[PDB]
Amino acid sequence: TATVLLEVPFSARGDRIPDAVAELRTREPIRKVRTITGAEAWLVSSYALCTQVLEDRRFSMKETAAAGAPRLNALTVPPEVVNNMGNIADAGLRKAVMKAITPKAPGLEQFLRDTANSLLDNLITEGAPADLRNDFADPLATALHCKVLGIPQEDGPKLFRSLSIAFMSSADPIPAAKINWDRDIEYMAGILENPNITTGLMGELSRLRKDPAYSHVSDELFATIGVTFFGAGVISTGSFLTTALISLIQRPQLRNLLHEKPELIPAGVEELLRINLSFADGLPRLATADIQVGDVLVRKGELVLVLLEGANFDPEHFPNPGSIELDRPNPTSHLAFGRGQHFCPGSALGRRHAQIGIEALLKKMPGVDLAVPIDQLVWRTRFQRRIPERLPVLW
Ligand code: HEM
Ligand SMILES: O=C(NCc1ccncc1)c1cn(-c2ccccc2)nc1-c1ccncc1
């Protein structure tokens, strides 16, 4: 019987990779698929071809926003914001933004530890079961990014609640995404006018905004940096930590090893990054030229999707790809933070968030385990991340 073109994404589950991925990688490491909008796209699933695409700027992020382009999903931001980092660089702000979001600031790591330990103490006092997403990982992500941005901790929860819509992966425009975007922009604009905001990213942007060398950088861009970096950082670190905790809980031998030898946690987090399924869709790019990728000539104007778990579970680059092995010779060569022009600017902060969160969890709850059968986790659909709605644990 005739069938329709293969549809992406394959599965919203973040606890297992579908067998189809390895089948595609072996047989058709670049092949045509249909996205949720009805558009056709090239899905790339081998390490070699994923890295080729991400290292060639003629596969353009900014052009994915063009009117009439084949789309992975609907925009939840204004089209100019797709080029956010390019706008930050053109404004002379890239070095200052990067420096502000490093985990190297004095007292930042101790703040993370204190916050993690307080969250865990509250869960222990309340008694099992505990929800490690809603009452540990996501609050830790939110508190971290309020600190990094320099904004009041009490404003975190409301900003966080915008994100279950802001990072939807939808076939159609989302009215609530515009409401939340506009409200979050007003908030960050007020922060830039708030005299008591003098630390972190927003404190630095506030100063530069009044410096004559930035006098024609737009107030809209300054506010956009705050919204985009809070939102991307919080959704990415919260979702990554949550699904890493699942992979750790399902490996009691590894859990016990990292509990016994916490100095191995950075290597453990790097493997947890490699095997992480938090990105629900391939990374989108639009070809600006005719470019050969494997056996396919991609034509100008076509959509390409870079499947991160295709690359990261490729046995030709990571032998025994499904096994967490702390002594690989190429441990940071995974694509969990992307590659090339748009490599994640928060990579160091995301690493340290997960490292400290796990260190604290294993000390407080060394017997941590799922409180429900793993198939009972509820995986969020039509979202740019894969996450369980709740993560119930005991200890
Ligand atoms: C474990 C945590 C994180 C993961 C797994 C992650 C993942 C990624 C990936 C894969 C990309 C590349 C997207 C592409 O090329 O299309 C990216 C870009 C980006 N990330 Fe992260 N990220 C994390 C944490 C953060 C944090 C903490 C921040 C900010 C505080 C952040 C802000 C951004 C921004 C703004 C971009 C866009 C860069 C550009 O367009 O050039 N991310 N991230
Ligand atoms: O969807 C978002 N990014 C993924 C994307 C993928 C392909 N094409 C466009 C965008 C996104 C959503 N928000 C947002 C935040 C608060 C309220 C409403 C929306 N911010 C961003 C964002 C973060 C960092 N850099 C740029 C954009």
Q: What is the DSSP code string of 296-320?
A: EEEPTT-EEEE-HHHHHT-TTTSSS
- Residue 236 Cβ inside 6 Å of ligand 1? The answer reads yes
C-alpha dist (Å) from residue 131 to 121, 144, 160, 256, 379: 13, 19, 17, 21, 14
285 assigned binding-site residue: yes
The first and second tokens of residue 60, run together, are 């353009």
115 assigned binding-site residue: no
- Residue 52 Cβ inside 6 Å of ligand 2? The answer reads no
* CA pair distance 347, 380, nearest whole angstrom: 24
- Residue 60 Cβ inside 6 Å of ligand 2? The answer reads no
Give the residue from 57, 44, 88 showing the smallest Cα distance to 341: 57
Q: Which atom of ligand 1 is nearest to the CA of 276?
A: 5
C-alpha dist (Å) from residue 149 to 76, 190, 201, 222: 22, 14, 4, 12
Distance (angstroms) between ligand 2 centre and the Cα of 47 equals: 26
Residue with tokens 């790339």: 44
- Which residue's alpha carbon is at the smallest distance from atom 9 of ligand 2? 82
The first and second tokens of residue 165, run together, are 């819509």
The first and second tokens of residue 356, run together, are 């400290």
Give the residue from 149, 170, 66, 98 showing the smallest Cα distance to 343: 98
300 assigned binding-site residue: yes
- Which residue's alpha carbon is at the smallest distance from atom 2 of ligand 2? 167
- Which residue's alpha carbon is at the smallest distance from atom 25 of ligand 2? 228
Distance (angstroms) between ligand 2 centre and the Cα of 276 equals: 20
Nearest ligand to the CA atom of 242: 1
- DSSP structure class, residue 218: -
Per-residue burial over 63-75, b = 16 or more CB atoms within 10 Å of its CB, e = otherwise: bbbeeeebbbbeb
* CA pair distance 391, 395, nearest whole angstrom: 13
Q: At what angle do helices 200-209 and 138-149 cross, to 10 degrees?
A: 30
Strands 30-34, 59-60: parallel, antiparallel or unpaired by DSSP?
Answer: unpaired
* CA pair distance 93, 224, nearest whole angstrom: 13
Within 8 A by CB and 6+ apart from 262, the residues are: 359, 362, 363
- Residue 232 Cβ inside 6 Å of ligand 1? The answer reads yes
* CA pair distance 37, 9, nearest whole angstrom: 12
* CA pair distance 389, 379, nearest whole angstrom: 6
- Residue 350 Cβ inside 6 Å of ligand 1? The answer reads yes
392-394 β-sheet, strand order: 130-131, 392-394, 369-370
The first and second tokens of residue 310, run together, are 């295709």
236 assigned binding-site residue: yes
Distance (angstroms) between ligand 1 centre and the Cα of 229 equals: 9
- Residue 88 Cβ inside 6 Å of ligand 1? The answer reads no
- Residue 167 Cβ inside 6 Å of ligand 1? The answer reads no
Beta bridge partners of 392: 131
Contacts for 55-60: CB closer than 8 Å, 24+ residues apart: 55/339, 55/340, 56/291, 56/340, 57/340, 57/341, 58/287, 58/288, 58/289, 58/291, 59/285, 59/286, 59/287, 59/288, 59/291, 59/304, 60/285, 60/286, 60/287, 60/288
Peptide bond into 70 cis (omega under 30): no
* CA pair distance 254, 326, nearest whole angstrom: 10
- Residue 227 Cβ inside 6 Å of ligand 2? The answer reads yes
**100 near 151, Cβ under 8 Å?**
no
- Residue 101 Cβ inside 6 Å of ligand 1? The answer reads yes
The first and second tokens of residue 282, run together, are 């391939």
For residue 251, which amino acid is it? R
Distance (angstroms) between ligand 1 centre and the Cα of 324 equals: 23
* CA pair distance 199, 171, nearest whole angstrom: 39
- DSSP structure class, residue 213: G
- Residue 29 Cβ inside 6 Å of ligand 1? The answer reads no
- Which residue's alpha carbon is at the smallest distance from atom 4 of ligand 2? 167
Ranges of beta strands (E only) in 76-176 are: 130-131
- Residue 35: left if φ>0, alpha if ψ -120 to 50, beta else—which one? beta
Cα angle 49, 51, 52; round to 5: 60
* CA pair distance 139, 69, nearest whole angstrom: 37
Domains annotated for the chain, with CATH where assigned, are 1-395 (1.10.630.10)
Distance (angstroms) between ligand 2 centre and the Cα of 170 equals: 13
Q: Which atom of ligand 1 is nearest to the CA of 340?
A: 15
Q: Is 312 exposed, middle or buried (0-12, 13-18, 19+ CB in 10 A)?
A: buried
- Residue 228 Cβ inside 6 Å of ligand 2? The answer reads yes
Q: Which atom of ligand 2 is nearest to the CA of 82?
A: 9
